[PDB]
């Protein structure tokens, strides 16, 4: 702006500023306006440039507060409740976004009690811009941890801050700038994208609003028409199958969990209805009951008797619905589920809870359900996600903050690049260098999360695009002032959004203690350093062994070894100190070792004694 003093949304009441450094305050005014600032009983002045931009440095201030900052020129603004602490930018895709509410079943006591005015959070609006690097955002405010705010905070960011605040005893500010499903190249500026012509040219393409409008309108009409035709052809809607009294005794049966592709319906999309009678004891009546219905591909509405109780519109959230008192009746009760499936295999994910819960008591809902096809629809092609295109997230969600002094970044991203791992080390290195060039800071620690275990286990040695993504992450640790949290032990085979985010936060906090704070503590997880061939044995040396390596719950697992024919076989591995000796009787001249090299390497059990799991790795470049 240029009519009067205006501050960025980030520079606002309740904010955290970075401690112990000359610290930037910035905003807009009239051109050449002289701005008077009073902070900690000292006067500052600065003059705006000819475009009405102004900036200065307040004196280095130690942790604590509160402080006011009074700003005056043609108008006046007071910032209240400002504190000094460590300010962290928190970014990535879905696993950085995932809120405390989504992981609540692991952390109910934490959520109920959360109250810490020194942990403060700033949610950045999730949007893009292809035409320019933005200087502000549309809205946002700093919030403190309270029982009323905690549920919507990023779980990883919250546990990271909880750890650091507990140890360092200073305020922690968290700026959450994340976007589900986003690939790394969405988060890189035009300058960084010059190294990636394919992505540079794509960003340029999307400067055309008419292109955007035509894509979005086409996608919207396809989706709307699909849902409308579905509803108009669904025999369950036409014939009121949601009714508790509908006689479904003639329907066929399938087990839940499971997918209807295994029934005579086969691999059809559209809608399928499910019914079950449940026996409810008298002592469960007139009380609130919880219904867990696992995870469903893609969407569901659930009815209990004649009452709609809830719906979920996409495949990723767990189904956790409440059944208020008064809906269940003595004995004879029906649950009805209408499942909508746009694409892929519709149904109920395995290894998830399907039950009613009251107190510590449960009624298991796994087993036989009656089912019938509602409407067979052709698969619905997914939208073009314009918000995943190169550059747009840098421009609208990172560029606004490049004047903010930070302690560092935490980053959890890569699932959306796991299909193209060969470029990822270079792409992610480019991102880190790109941001550092915008902040221009004496140091800028960049801490990131290696992808978790996911998908099915595998009995024999094999290659894996997820393992290749994880390895690209591990190799990025060559970049200065970086650290990594390993998560191969705390993911879930059947869920890309695992609930254990406290261990993620704690592992990032360990990295921060070492990298950002220069503490004399183990840096995190054991990392492959070097190999030596000696006869039938390869000796692996590790960094970050702390007080020693160990194998949990058995001998060293998930090591494989290969000779020059590149055929890996499960190897024996023995720990000697900070080294692991890997060998197979079946291979006389080994040239390569792999550890935990799978989508889901259950059995990879190497830790340091400080509790941090070794990174998976490979010695080869095949
Ligand atoms: Ca104020
Ligand atoms: Ca340009
Ligand atoms: Ca991709
Ligand atoms: Ca390093």
Residue numbers in the entry: 19 to 640
Could you pull the original sentences from the published paper?
We determined the full-length structures of two members (Fl8CE20_II and PpCE20_II) from the carbohydrate esterase family 20 (CE20) by X-ray crystallography that feature an ancillary domain, inserted into the catalytic SGNH-hydrolase domain. Detailed structural analysis identifies a so far undescribed catalytic triad architecture which lacks the typical aspartate for polarization of the histidine but instead reveals a precisely coordinated water molecule mediating contact between the His and Asp. This coordinated water in the Ser-His-(H2O-Asp/Asn) motif, as further confirmed by mutational studies and by determination of kinetic constants, is crucial for catalytic activity. We therefore term this active site architecture a water-mediated catalytic triad.
Fl8CE20_II was previously proven to solely act as a de-O-acetylase on acetylated xylans. The ancillary domain of Fl8CE20_II has a β-sandwich fold, composed by eight antiparallel β-strands, reminiscent from β-galactosidases of the GH2 family (PFAM PF02837 or PF13364). In both crystal structures of Fl8CE20_II and PpCE20_II, representing the only structures of CE20 enzymes featuring the inserted ancillary domain solved so far, the Asp (Fl8CE20_II: Asp513; PpCE20_II: Asp518) carboxylate has a distance to the catalytic His Nδ of 4.0 Å which is too far away for a direct interaction. Instead, the Asp side chain contributes to precisely coordinating a water molecule (Fl8CE20_II: 2.9 Å), which is in direct hydrogen bond distance to the catalytic His base (Fl8CE20_II: 2.9 Å). The tetrahedral coordination geometry of this water molecule is completed by interaction with a main chain carbonyl oxygen of Tyr334 in the ancillary domain and by another water molecule. Moreover, besides coordinating the water molecule, Asp513 in the SGNH hydrolase domain forms a direct salt bridge to Lys370 of the ancillary domain. Thus, Asp513 has a dual function, i.e., a catalytic role in coordinating and positioning the catalytic water molecule and a structural role in binding and orienting the ancillary domain with direct consequences on substrate binding. As expected, the mutation Asp513 to Ala in Fl8CE20_II (D513A) resulted in complete inactivation of the enzyme showing the importance of this residue for catalysis. In conclusion, we could clearly show that the active site Asp/Asn side chain of Fl8CE20_II is in fact, crucial for catalytic activity, while it is, in contrast to a conventional triad, not directly interacting with the His.
